Amino acid sequence: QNMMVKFAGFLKPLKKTVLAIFLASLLYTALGIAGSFYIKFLFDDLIKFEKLNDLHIISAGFAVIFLLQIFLNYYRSILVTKLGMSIDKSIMMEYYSHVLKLPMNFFNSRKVGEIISRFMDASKIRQAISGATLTIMIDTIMAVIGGILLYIQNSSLFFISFIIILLYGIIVTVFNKPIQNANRQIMEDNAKLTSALVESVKGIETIKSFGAEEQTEKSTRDKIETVMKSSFKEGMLYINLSSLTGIVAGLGGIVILWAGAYNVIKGNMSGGQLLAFNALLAYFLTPVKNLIDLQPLIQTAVVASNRLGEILELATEKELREDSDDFVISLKGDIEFRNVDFRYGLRKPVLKNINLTIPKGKTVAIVGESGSGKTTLAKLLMNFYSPEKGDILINGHSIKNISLELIRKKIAFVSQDVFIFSGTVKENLALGNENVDMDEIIKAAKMANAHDFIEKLPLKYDTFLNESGANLSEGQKQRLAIARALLKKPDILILDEDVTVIIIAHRLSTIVNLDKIYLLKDGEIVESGSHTELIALKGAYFKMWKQTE
Amino acid sequence: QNMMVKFAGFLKPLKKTVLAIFLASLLYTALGIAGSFYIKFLFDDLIKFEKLNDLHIISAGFAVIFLLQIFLNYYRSILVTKLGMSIDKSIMMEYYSHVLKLPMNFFNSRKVGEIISRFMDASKIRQAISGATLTIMIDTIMAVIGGILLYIQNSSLFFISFIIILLYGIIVTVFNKPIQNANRQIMEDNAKLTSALVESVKGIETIKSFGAEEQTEKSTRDKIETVMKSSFKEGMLYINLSSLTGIVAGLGGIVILWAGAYNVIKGNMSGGQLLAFNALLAYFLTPVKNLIDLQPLIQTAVVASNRLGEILELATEKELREDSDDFVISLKGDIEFRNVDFRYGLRKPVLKNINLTIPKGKTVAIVGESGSGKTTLAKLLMNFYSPEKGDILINGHSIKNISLELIRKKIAFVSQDVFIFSGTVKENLALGNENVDMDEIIKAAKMANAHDFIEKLPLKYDTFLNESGANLSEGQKQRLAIARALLKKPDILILDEATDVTVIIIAHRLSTIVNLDKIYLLKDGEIVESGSHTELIALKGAYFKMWKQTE
Ligand SMILES: Nc1ncnc2c1ncn2[C@@H]1O[C@H](COP(=O)(O)OP(=O)(O)OP(=O)(O)O)[C@@H](O)[C@H]1O
Numbered sequence A: 001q002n003m004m005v006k007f008a009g010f011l012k013p014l015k016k017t018v019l020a021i022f023l024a025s026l027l028y029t030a031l032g033i034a035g036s037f038y039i040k041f042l043f044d045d046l047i048k049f050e051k052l053n054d055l056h057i058i059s060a061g062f063a064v065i066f067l068l069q070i071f072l073n074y075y076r077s078i079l080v081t082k083l084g085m086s087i088d089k090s091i092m093m094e095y096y097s098h099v100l101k102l103p104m105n106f107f108n109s110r111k112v113g114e115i116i117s118r119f120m121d122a123s124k125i126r127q128a129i130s131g132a133t134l135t136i137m138i139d140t141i142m143a144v145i146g147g148i149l150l151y152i153q154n155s156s157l158f159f160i161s162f163i164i165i166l167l168y169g170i171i172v173t174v175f176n177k178p179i180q181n182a183n184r185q186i187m188e189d190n191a192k193l194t195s196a197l198v199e200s201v202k203g204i205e206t207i208k209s210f211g212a213e214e215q216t217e218k219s220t221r222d223k224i225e226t227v228m229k230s231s232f233k234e235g236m237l238y239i240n241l242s243s244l245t246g247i248v249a250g251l252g253g254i255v256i257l258w259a260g261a262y263n264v265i266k267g268n269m270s271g272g273q274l275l276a277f278n279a280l281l282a283y284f285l286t287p288v289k290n291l292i293d294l295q296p297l298i299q300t301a302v303v304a305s306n307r308l309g310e311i312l313e314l315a316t317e318k319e320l321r322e323d324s325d326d327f328v329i330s331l332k333g334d335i336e337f338r339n340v341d342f343r344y345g346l347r348k349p350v351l352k353n354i355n356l357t358i359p360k361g362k363t364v365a366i367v368g369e370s371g372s373g374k375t376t377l378a379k380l381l382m383n384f385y386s387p388e389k390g391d392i393l394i395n396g397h398s399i400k401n402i403s404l405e406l407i408r409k410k411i412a413f414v415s416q417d418v419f420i421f422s423g424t425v426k427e428n429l430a431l432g433n434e435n436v437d438m439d440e441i442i443k444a445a446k447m448a449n450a451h452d453f454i455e456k457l458p459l460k461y462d463t464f465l466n467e468s469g470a471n472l473s474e475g476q477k478q479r480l481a482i483a484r485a486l487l488k489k490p491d492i493l494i495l496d497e498d499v500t501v502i503i504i505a506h507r508l509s510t511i512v513n514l515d516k517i518y519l520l521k522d523g524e525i526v527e528s529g530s531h532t533e534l535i536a537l538k539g540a541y542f543k544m545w546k547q548t549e
Numbered sequence B: 001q002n003m004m005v006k007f008a009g010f011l012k013p014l015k016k017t018v019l020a021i022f023l024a025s026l027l028y029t030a031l032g033i034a035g036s037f038y039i040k041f042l043f044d045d046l047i048k049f050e051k052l053n054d055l056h057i058i059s060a061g062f063a064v065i066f067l068l069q070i071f072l073n074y075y076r077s078i079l080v081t082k083l084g085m086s087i088d089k090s091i092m093m094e095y096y097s098h099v100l101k102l103p104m105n106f107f108n109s110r111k112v113g114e115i116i117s118r119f120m121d122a123s124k125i126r127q128a129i130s131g132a133t134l135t136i137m138i139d140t141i142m143a144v145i146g147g148i149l150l151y152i153q154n155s156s157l158f159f160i161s162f163i164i165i166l167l168y169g170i171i172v173t174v175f176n177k178p179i180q181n182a183n184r185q186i187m188e189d190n191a192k193l194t195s196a197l198v199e200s201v202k203g204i205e206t207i208k209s210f211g212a213e214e215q216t217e218k219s220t221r222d223k224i225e226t227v228m229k230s231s232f233k234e235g236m237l238y239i240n241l242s243s244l245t246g247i248v249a250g251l252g253g254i255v256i257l258w259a260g261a262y263n264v265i266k267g268n269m270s271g272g273q274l275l276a277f278n279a280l281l282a283y284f285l286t287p288v289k290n291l292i293d294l295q296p297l298i299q300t301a302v303v304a305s306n307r308l309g310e311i312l313e314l315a316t317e318k319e320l321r322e323d324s325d326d327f328v329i330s331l332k333g334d335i336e337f338r339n340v341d342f343r344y345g346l347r348k349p350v351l352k353n354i355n356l357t358i359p360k361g362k363t364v365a366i367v368g369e370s371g372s373g374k375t376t377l378a379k380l381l382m383n384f385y386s387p388e389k390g391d392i393l394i395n396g397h398s399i400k401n402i403s404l405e406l407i408r409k410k411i412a413f414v415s416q417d418v419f420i421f422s423g424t425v426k427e428n429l430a431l432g433n434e435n436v437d438m439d440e441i442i443k444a445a446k447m448a449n450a451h452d453f454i455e456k457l458p459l460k461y462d463t464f465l466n467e468s469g470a471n472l473s474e475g476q477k478q479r480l481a482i483a484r485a486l487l488k489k490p491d492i493l494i495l496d497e498a499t500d501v502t503v504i505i506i507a508h509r510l511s512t513i514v515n516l517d518k519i520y521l522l523k524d525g526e527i528v529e530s531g532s533h534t535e536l537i538a539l540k541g542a543y544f545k546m547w548k549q550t551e
């Protein structure tokens, strides 16, 4: 429905191409019809009258007609391939561009394969256009014209043919829903297999280290077996459809001939009148059979399009929050949490009522226990997820009224899962903005003390890095990631071990001498202040310090 | 290449099914030939004789023979489907089970999209099996028989028909190689695109954080445009091939009719001979053209079967060493790194001549600046990469002699990265051996101080964890990994930053290992300074300066 409107909008710029395809199709059909008159004239005129030069002229003419037919087919086929390629590219690009903008909980709740599997299933829309456009354009008009011609030719035999077509229609609508169910099932099974296979290949180090190759092999064999069962149950459905349609066609033809012979035996028609009708049936039954044979392709394309559209209907990140203010550009200092409450989906609320303030341009630290909301605060400050019953204010302006691009550009976050893409270091070290000069990159790298190891690399800053940065070590990857973050020139820098920096450290030894320290326990700030104040108050910080040290 | 042998080996257990397919298809063709006489028998011999009961009997008979035709088609098709699934499943399973055994040099070189793209391009072989087998088996025999019938019928035009076959042969030979080139190019471009897609997702955190949703879009658009260019070249090549074949076929039919007409005009064979020849021509040219129409499809099946081949020929991990299990089943300490130099693929030598000993028990620690190669030593003890020159002795016997399975089952190594498989906490905790009682898992989780958060989770040890363990935090993931390693009951335990059994601790901060037994300092891939904490600090060496810098 909506997706069909989308395809209509995609086809609208290609009206000239579609019209050219249609005109070439009409010329090809007309030449194909005129082709058989070669034999028809040859064995009625040329042979009986013993003409030689006339025979040569006629043979050359029919060869010329056939050559024009082939050229028209060639031109039409090129145009149809162009149309299919354009539509497929547009679908893939739109889907991918929308996926990259989805909210984060979508990515956290969906397997990798099931996000790209649908992408790879956009080829079935391309495989449906190329294999059905010509048929839909020519055989519809061919069938209508054939119906008119049979109606003016005979009455009773035309009604028998109409019963054949009605039976065709009854067959098609019965096998409509089950084919969709089979297609959806096989698509879901392929998605699950792809997801599990990607997940197994990526983390091969753990499998090899624990020697769990047998378990992974058995699980993938189970998933392949499920794929086979679904594909078998779909293939039986297709073969049932094909056999039943074939029986209808063959028995319809035989009954047509039987009725014609019976009528010829009595006085109803003449043998020539039956032969002409039988010859003319080749322009009516065959087109409808050709339209109905397309059913698997169009059904698969419709299911694939619905599966793609199940994602496109989702709301992107920017579509969730409204308004942009745009008056604020200088996000700096005085970060405020105002009665913030957060809860990941339906789990217990990990982040209860908290009210914490951060002074302008000061180095503050967060200390808690494993399971508290430290990284949750870090991700919440950069608006990956929105809170429930609170506001986050920066310099008196709410986080909800600041454009996403400003937040992403102006706040840097250095997590523990460093990701390094495939490509040269210059690309990895400059990901956000593809405009910086080498002086800034070198300054940022020297600031993070990443200049040594990057010098030691073969092609200085132009060395190639394998996927997931396996070409480097863990420390080198962490240093390169912190250099990339520092290159951003941020105003709010979060580190997860006049620019405000928040350090999230699990070791209390490095927390000392960091201005203000926030003790986050049970999803609430139990205590806050400088290190000396927490030591003097003999709070939970004192016990934590005594236990760790 | 040599994949045909393995294909034949797969086919060998299915000889009965293949024979049944052949017999059913042959009966289908014979019934089709017999039933194609209905119109001629009706018009020529039935209606002109005014027979009505005979009409009814013959029409019923031809309906019956058609229904038999449909039953044979149903049986043949279901057998072909079963054959296709069987071979396809066998091929994919063999490929995957081989990939899981390749050495780590293969995984750090390729991408995580090339391997999966090669796996998923094995459905082309199933498409070929489902599409071409029937046409081949019937139409080869049909073409041979049609040729014999044409030769016995008239020898004047059979030579023109042979000329047509020769033109098909030349066209196929000319278009053989460019089709393979185009197929290989499109498969390689799809592999690149799929790898880019997989890398962009699971990594979306960094893209969103750095605001790179447009640059990634641009790169993926360029890759899709390259795929479309290769696809267009392949499509144009296919259309050129099909147009040449169509021209040859149509012009050959017209030329045969022209030659027959010219023959009939002169004092030669009568028109009835020409009609018989034209009727027989549908039994020779139409089948042989059907084989030629299988040229593209079959080629796309061959190239895929070649791609899988160049993964299977790679030497596995178990095949690059000799087994000397004998009686050693215990890695009980006394580790010795004799003179060993290890280089990675081609970069530089990162480990120079190394000589060290680790006692039977005790807790030992290795320190050194980034790039020294501590993780390299840890990976060497697991035999992920074999040393270029030298040997590593576990207890009097080198690792090369000890079986791989025993090494992987007795040494635990917790790394900086933690991988959590999608599933349940119980399944992730029990990854090595599937059959573990609940008591052992609970004890291991308690030892790693990870039972508390598991218990606080909903459904205790069920807590279905999403991909990459996104359901849990990072500290919980580290605790889970340590618990999983401890469940292994290891003889050697290697501990990274993630925090009578020999313990090797790779420590980044010098203050966490001051009370250990021995400390090894890696400088320029060497252990120039070694000993306990007291000796190094008193020596006023590089360790002393490192300690002062830390303090
Ligand atoms: N896959 C690889 N291919 C090539 N060189 C590599 C590869 N992995 C690491 N190296 C390099 O070889 C050395 C191995 O370092 P290793 O991984 O042992 O880290 P490290 O010295 O413990 O440092 P850190 O713990 O700070 O990451 C480093 O110089 C690193 O740059």
Ligand SMILES: Nc1ncnc2c1ncn2[C@@H]1O[C@H](COP(=O)(O)OP(=O)(O)OP(=O)(O)O)[C@@H](O)[C@H]1O
Pocket (backbone or CB within 6 Å): A108, A344, A347, A350, A368, A369, A370, A371, A372, A373, A374, A375, A376, A377, A506, B470, B471, B472, B473, B474, B475, B476
């Ligand atoms: N994607 C998620 N879905 C559901 N719950 C989650 C998700 N990510 C984290 N949690 C839960 O949210 C809580 C807070 O986790 P968080 O990352 O803030 O902890 P932390 O204190 O930073 O961790 P660490 O132990 O690594 O220092 C934990 O109970 C964790 O299990």
